[PDB]
Design an enzyme around this catalytic site. Structure first.
Site, PDB file in Angstrom:
ATOM      1  N   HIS A 219       0.939  -1.542  -0.036  1.00 34.79           N
ATOM      2  CA  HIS A 219      -0.666   0.151   0.195  1.00 34.79           C
ATOM      3  C   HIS A 219       0.531   1.259  -0.526  1.00 34.79           C
ATOM      4  O   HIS A 219       0.219   2.465  -0.541  1.00 34.79           O
ATOM      5  CB  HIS A 219      -0.928  -0.124   1.241  1.00 34.79           C
ATOM      6  CG  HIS A 219      -1.358  -1.550   1.397  1.00 34.79           C
ATOM      7  ND1 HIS A 219      -1.788  -2.320   2.584  1.00 34.79           N
ATOM      8  CD2 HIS A 219      -2.976  -1.643   0.287  1.00 34.79           C
ATOM      9  CE1 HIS A 219      -2.448  -3.249   1.842  1.00 34.79           C
ATOM     10  NE2 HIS A 219      -3.076  -3.817   1.012  1.00 34.79           N
TER      11      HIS A 219
ATOM     12  N   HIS B 230       5.018   6.858   6.836  1.00 33.80           N
ATOM     13  CA  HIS B 230       5.502   5.972   5.278  1.00 33.80           C
ATOM     14  C   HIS B 230       4.533   8.090   5.264  1.00 33.80           C
ATOM     15  O   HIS B 230       4.044   8.184   5.169  1.00 33.80           O
ATOM     16  CB  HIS B 230       4.109   5.096   5.454  1.00 33.80           C
ATOM     17  CG  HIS B 230       2.845   5.509   6.099  1.00 33.80           C
ATOM     18  ND1 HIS B 230       2.108   5.041   7.660  1.00 33.80           N
ATOM     19  CD2 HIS B 230       1.411   5.965   5.675  1.00 33.80           C
ATOM     20  CE1 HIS B 230       1.093   5.828   7.796  1.00 33.80           C
ATOM     21  NE2 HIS B 230       0.321   6.402   6.814  1.00 33.80           N
TER      22      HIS B 230
ATOM     23  N   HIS C  42       1.810   9.192   1.375  1.00 33.80           N
ATOM     24  CA  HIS C  42       0.672   8.625   0.030  1.00 33.80           C
ATOM     25  C   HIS C  42       0.721   9.779  -0.760  1.00 33.80           C
ATOM     26  O   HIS C  42       1.587  11.081  -0.626  1.00 33.80           O
ATOM     27  CB  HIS C  42      -0.882   9.193   1.503  1.00 33.80           C
ATOM     28  CG  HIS C  42      -1.551   8.450   2.716  1.00 33.80           C
ATOM     29  ND1 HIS C  42      -1.953   7.297   2.149  1.00 33.80           N
ATOM     30  CD2 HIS C  42      -0.833   8.282   4.006  1.00 33.80           C
ATOM     31  CE1 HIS C  42      -1.960   6.471   3.713  1.00 33.80           C
ATOM     32  NE2 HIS C  42      -1.139   7.510   4.277  1.00 33.80           N
TER      33      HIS C  42
ATOM     34  N   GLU D  85      -3.947  13.560   1.573  1.00 30.63           N
ATOM     35  CA  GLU D  85      -5.372  12.698   1.874  1.00 30.63           C
ATOM     36  C   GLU D  85      -5.715  13.792   2.239  1.00 30.63           C
ATOM     37  O   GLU D  85      -7.186  14.515   2.045  1.00 30.63           O
ATOM     38  CB  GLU D  85      -4.419  11.646   3.291  1.00 30.63           C
ATOM     39  CG  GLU D  85      -4.235  10.507   2.344  1.00 30.63           C
ATOM     40  CD  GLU D  85      -4.387   9.423   3.041  1.00 30.63           C
ATOM     41  OE1 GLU D  85      -4.178   9.645   4.320  1.00 30.63           O
ATOM     42  OE2 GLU D  85      -5.050   8.296   2.420  1.00 30.63           O
TER      43      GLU D  85
ATOM     44  N   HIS E 141       3.298  10.439   7.334  1.00 33.93           N
ATOM     45  CA  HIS E 141       2.274  10.454   8.017  1.00 33.93           C
ATOM     46  C   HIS E 141       3.494   9.774   9.136  1.00 33.93           C
ATOM     47  O   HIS E 141       3.926   8.781   9.380  1.00 33.93           O
ATOM     48  CB  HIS E 141       0.650   9.774   7.978  1.00 33.93           C
ATOM     49  CG  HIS E 141      -0.306   9.539   7.781  1.00 33.93           C
ATOM     50  ND1 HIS E 141      -0.714   9.377   7.060  1.00 33.93           N
ATOM     51  CD2 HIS E 141      -0.286  11.620   7.637  1.00 33.93           C
ATOM     52  CE1 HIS E 141      -1.561   9.775   6.530  1.00 33.93           C
ATOM     53  NE2 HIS E 141      -1.345  11.537   6.145  1.00 33.93           N
TER      54      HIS E 141
ATOM     55  N   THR F 211      -6.898   6.008   8.222  1.00 33.33           N
ATOM     56  CA  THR F 211      -7.245   6.410   7.021  1.00 33.33           C
ATOM     57  C   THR F 211      -6.837   5.065   5.731  1.00 33.33           C
ATOM     58  O   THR F 211      -7.668   5.102   4.487  1.00 33.33           O
ATOM     59  CB  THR F 211      -6.128   7.490   5.657  1.00 33.33           C
ATOM     60  OG1 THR F 211      -5.373   7.113   5.580  1.00 33.33           O
ATOM     61  CG2 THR F 211      -6.197   8.943   6.887  1.00 33.33           C
TER      62      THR F 211
END
Ligand SMILES: [Co+2]
Length: 258
Positions: A62, A92, A94, A104, A117, A196
């Protein structure tokens, strides 16, 4: 099916296995800056990362997680809206397929190229698995990335990515200093929300920094060379691994600054 970010198993499908996806305190959200309330009762954040012990970097299918030793109070978050001590377990990102999307959280509907994050758990609960079952279990520090100058502190991360290209691959990642990923100012917005990604548990105090960090186009392009798939499967680039903004519902976003 197994959840992800594709056409048929993306965020709009998650509520079928994880009904809390339509819950009262889901994340991320749009931060309407005019509507957020300055809360002078809020303390300055305390980020104490001097003794952080990074261990490993993992591609989990992911995102990639830089993992830390959280068996002691080595890297902690305190203060701000928080009660007690929260231990860093992993960070990590996104990111998008293009610089126009990837974050996000959004700020007055503005999307950044990426979002970092830093995930911390409340110690009072002993372990991460227990903490995610509690409304005050986690504190996640969110930092926006925009594309511009390179972020020197990020390059060590970018350079190991070709060793963990596919799902399930990991690599040693010691002596990384996450202080090199922080912007100058710790001014922030905060609200109660959720993880999330599935299981979308409603266990997170979000602390989102106002000041973005800048990274270079070359740095983010290396993120986009990762893969969602496992080794020797058809290549699906790991891009657009972000959940869009969710309804704010009965929540107030507070600002630490004026
Ligand atoms: Co995240």
């Amino acid at each position: 099916h197994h959840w992800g970010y594709g056409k048929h198993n993306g965020p709009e499908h998650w509520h079928k296995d994880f009904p809390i996806a339509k819950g009262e305190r889901q994340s991320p959200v749009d931060i309407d800056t005019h509507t957020a309330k300055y809360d002078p009762s809020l303390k300055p954040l305390s980020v104490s990362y001097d003794q952080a012990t990074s261990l490993r970097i993992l591609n989990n299918g992911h995102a990639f997680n830089v993992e830390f030793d959280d068996s002691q109070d080595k890297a902690v978050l305190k203060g701000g809206p928080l009660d007690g001590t929260y231990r860093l377990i992993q960070f990590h990102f996104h990111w998008g397929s293009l610089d126009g999307q990837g974050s996000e959280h959004t700020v007055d509907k503005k999307k950044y190229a990426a979002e970092l994050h830093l995930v911390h758990w409340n110690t009072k609960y002993g372990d991460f698995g227990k903490a995610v079952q509690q409304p005050d279990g986690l504190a996640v520090l969110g930092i926006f990335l925009k594309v511009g100058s390179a972020k020197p502190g990020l390059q060590k991360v970018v350079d190991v990515l070709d060793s963990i290209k596919t799902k399930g691959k990991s690599a040693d990642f010691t002596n990384f200093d996450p202080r090199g990923l922080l912007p100058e100012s710790l001014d922030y917005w905060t609200y109660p929300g959720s993880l999330t990604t599935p299981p979308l548990l409603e266990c997170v105090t979000w602390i989102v920094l106002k000041e973005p960090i800048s990274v270079s186009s070359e740095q983010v392009l290396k993120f986009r060379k990762l893969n969602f798939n496992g080794e020797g499967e058809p290549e699906e680039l790991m891009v657009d691994n972000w959940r869009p903004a969710q309804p704010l519902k009965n929540r107030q976003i507070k600002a630490s600054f004026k």
